[PDB]
Design a protein around this ligand. Structure first.
Ligand SMILES: [K+]
Ligand SMILES: [K+]
Ligand SMILES: [K+]
Ligand SMILES: [K+]
Lengths: 349, 349, 349, 349
């Protein structure tokens, strides 16, 4: 009913009393808090603050709580000017969600102290000196493990085996680390759904199941042997770029389906267009359409080994079209992935 | 003649009566609708609304209907503030056309009910459960058809033929689907000009004409056989990225002419510059200028099979220039295509 | 001395009389032109125009002539609002130079009429029907000429020669066209400095000098023969993308020097780093540092023919570094070239 | 206590006296300087200046010194309007640091004159004609030196050696130049920490140590011989793009660690996934996991020599995945490097 004139260094704003009456916990809400700024001479609440930012605040008061930072007032000034009018931590968290970078999560510390000290030791390498010692010994053990996996397959080589002893030491360290992390955890229920620990479990299961099978088929001699390579992803816990890549390959999971689907269409199109072109030629490298898949996938991605290439004046035309088509399809859903990685990289820094 | 002062929370706007008299169906147009906001004390129409957005509204009233959203007021607030002053659905559709994303099309439903129910069943997979069942069976039939086209050409293989029986089943399903879509259509005239149905017709004509020719030349044994591959594009009806790609390759049809023309110039330039360089050498792979086309098109697009490469200290210079020139020409009209795909992808989402 | 209050729909602007007295040919300059807008009631020049645009106009009046379009008011409104206050064609051309797209050039027409009619016939294909006929016959003659240059070098082939007769016809057409363009020109002095005509001269000189030499050395049998290929650039007069490419490769002539210099450094670095690595090996493909240039330039540009590749566990490391280095150097000065092409392409459209 | 109304051409700003009293050396600070603008009629300090820029100035006066250029007022106007109110060189340097391009460094000239003249002669080629003569002779000597390093290793060739005499002349010139730069320097302490002189020292040490060893092992016959190539980086002193590249490869040193780490993960993943796939095949090119590193690094970077490629229907699948994975990883940290180069290139121009 009563009009409140708010003189932001000359810029007058007029509002109804009810519009401020929405929030009785803000600076303009309580009559007593704002009464010091009242000037009897012109009956206007004199402020000397930033001008282009009070408009957003007033719209907040006039919209029930919505806050939109105008692009004119930079982030710092608008932060200072949302603090001054003391809209509250709720409004500030709302503005944080609107602008992005929602760093409102807090890592929960174990209930007791001893277990919490274990946690701060094994996790958060920067917490303590011994913590960073542990977190560097557990990256040297991983590098030793990778070297012993890659070096065990040499032709000169392939339980007195030194490589077996090194692998057993690596698994013992992995087990000890995982046991400390699971037992001394704040909650097993939250621990269970965590990729960085499912990886640590998957990188140790093959060794245990191998010992069980040997102590007591072709699947457990090739698939398990390959699964043993997942210890390369345990190098994500002690690294930062890898977590960014994992979050990128999780956010942009549809623009990888597009890349694979576009490749699958361009292979079935150009391989079938180059086989039917070489059909009469007796010198052709392509015996059938499913044979030219290996040519289309190394032409569209512009690798081009040269082991299989077209050999008629009609397969050369299709292989001129295939390179341009591969450039167009594999570079139409990659920039989306690169923009999502750029966002997931510059948010943290 | 009379000046109307409009106090947008202190920000006064003064306008002539004639300027509001243009539109007698808006909030400020009818005197009775706006009379509730009139304040006798200062003779100004008091509003408590968003300030930076009323300027665009006033310019609308002062320009005969033109609307331009100022970049200061975000889309949501400006939408709320074009609703409040009730400019009309016409102005709102105009603002939608100005900002982009013209989602004003409505799918026409068949006149009757039974035919409309058929339509909602075969089209719009999300409409009904059986609708999504049909729309997934018709993607499995397509995948079976592609597998039978790609697998019929194996050397071990090439009407008791199992592959013929599978292909006949696929064509019968395609025919049944197309017949349901054409008969139970809202309008055959609008149905005719639709790419996604011309594709469905082109992917079934070769089978019918083959049966006709066999039941009763070299063209119908190679060109038709190749045309049978167009069933890979029937996988666009049951997919979303493919429609985006088709619209991209339709919007940016000049920046593909540029890519093909730039390739055609760089081939005729560098192949003719590498043949004349290898002319005296007896070991050269290039016998003539039209022979070095197959080297220039696999060098400029940076595939490089190695089957044909230069062999003098003067063809090696031209093959050092060719790679850099191919990078420069094929990556000068591709970013336009990628920006048009980015627009056609982020409009829908 | 006297303050002029200018009420832009409530937004008052106050200025000195001297500030408007700078320009006695504008709307606010002449007292008689602006006197109709004077309102005796409040003594303020009432306007109902766009508000956010009059600030730029007032700054123009207060800065001696400088004009800067504020990013708030779109181009169309600001154009309308620079027309209304009738700042002049001079100010409008200044604003055109500030915003870009300086389309103020006008093609000069020949002094007389007959010669001007010839010009409108041979140039400006869209001017007349016969003009477009000529401009399409002169693109078919060019394509015939390219085909006869590329097809004369076939092994089966290489003055009763049909190819000679076709080439003579092409040169006769080129000569006739060039003669019409030079004679019936507005100015030979301006005609001389024009690339698109220097190209037309260079594509015809080799034929004349060949006839002179044959009618009456090794240089005139290879270099001139290669120079004959410049008729591919005569296809720029009858094309639009090619002119954009030529202007791109003229504007960004320093970011090609960077590409060539970066390649020249990475070749001299990695070829010298891979030769010294393979020195003891007897199976190496690299005999000397200037021999590994042909490997470094097909690795850094990621073509990779495979004709020359490293063969020790120390040349394989350098060839792992070479691919990543080539990606980093040849893709550090290419995006500048692509942005200059994007500007030179979207300016015209 | 007293309110100062500042009429920026109608736009009134009201401020406390204390807010201007912060800075007693600015235009509004001293009462005498601002008294000429005081108007007794309305008691407001009349200015006719740019309107959208005075808000930033007022916020400067109200924030203790902080300055943020609003994006509405272009750089030129805001520069003019920070000069007018004479905020000071300190504020102007602060605004320069805020906007970027901190060109506040000044090259220190030697204390005396003769030594300063030497400096202006050897450095700053544009200072003097003889200076540019020296700075071009020292780029021809470098090019001669590179040619003699690259040409000494030819098979036909490998102290009467002409190549030795040319190399000795080059080193003598390098020594003379370095001696002049170090002796006639403003400060040896600042001279020591400078990359462009450490390079000049490293490109001359190998020759001196070679003469010492020969005048009076395998390391000094290969590693030193390779180190002799660092004279290619002495071509950075007499070039501008190279300094930009060096600053790019210094600023973005983490997004190269990402490229190398992503390559190291994708090699250990796909090489181990293609070796285990080819294990039973007797025709495989991969004998062990550390052997397939040379395939993964020439597939992921899409070079693809063809010397080693997969040969089973299970290694071909992994080599279809490897090309797409290499495109995704090596093009996820390259655009950061390219944006840092774009910044370091367009700052100087
Ligand atoms: K390649
Ligand atoms: K290749
Ligand atoms: K190759
Ligand atoms: K490539």
């Amino acid at each position: 009913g009563e009009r409140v004139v708010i003189n932001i260094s000359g810029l007058r704003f007029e509002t109804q009393l009810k519009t401020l009456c929405q929030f009785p916990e803000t600076l303009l809400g309580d009559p007593k808090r704002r009464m010091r700024y009242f000037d009897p001479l012109r009956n206007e609440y004199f402020f000397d603050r930033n001008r282009p930012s009070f408009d957003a605040i007033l719209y907040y008061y006039q919209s029930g709580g919505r806050i939109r930072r105008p692009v004119n007032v930079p982030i710092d000034i608008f932060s200072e000017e949302i603090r001054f009018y003391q809209l509250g931590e709720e409004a500030m968290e709302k503005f944080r969600e609107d602008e992005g970078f929602l760093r409102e999560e807090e890592r929960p510390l174990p209930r007791r102290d001893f277990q919490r000290q274990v946690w701060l030791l094994f996790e958060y390498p920067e917490s303590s000196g011994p913590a960073r010692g542990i977190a560097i010994v557990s990256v040297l053990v991983i590098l030793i493990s990778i070297v012993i996996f890659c070096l065990e397959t040499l032709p000169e080589f392939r339980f007195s085996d030194p490589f077996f002893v090194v692998e057993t030491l690596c698994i013992i360290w992995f087990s000890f680390e995982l046991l400390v992390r699971f037992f001394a955890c704040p909650s097993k229920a939250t621990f269970s759904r965590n990729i960085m620990n499912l990886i640590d479990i998957v990188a140790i299961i093959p060794y245990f199941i191998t010992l069980g099978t040997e102590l007591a088929s072709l699947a457990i001699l090739r698939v398990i042997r390959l699964v043993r390579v997942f210890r390369i992803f345990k190098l994500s816990r002690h690294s930062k770029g890898l977590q960014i890549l994992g979050q990128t390959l999780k956010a942009s999971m549809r623009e990888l389906g597009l890349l694979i689907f576009f490749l699958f269409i361009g292979v079935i199109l150009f391989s079938s267009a180059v086989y039917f072109a070489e059909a009469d030629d007796p010198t052709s490298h392509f015996s059938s359409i499913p044979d030219a898949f290996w040519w289309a996938v190394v032409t569209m991605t512009t690798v081009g080994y040269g082991d299989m290439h077209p050999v008629t004046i009609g397969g050369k035309i299709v292989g001129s079209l295939c390179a341009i088509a591969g450039v167009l399809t594999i570079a139409l859903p990659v920039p989306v992935i690169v923009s999502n990685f750029n966002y997931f990289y510059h948010r943290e820094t």
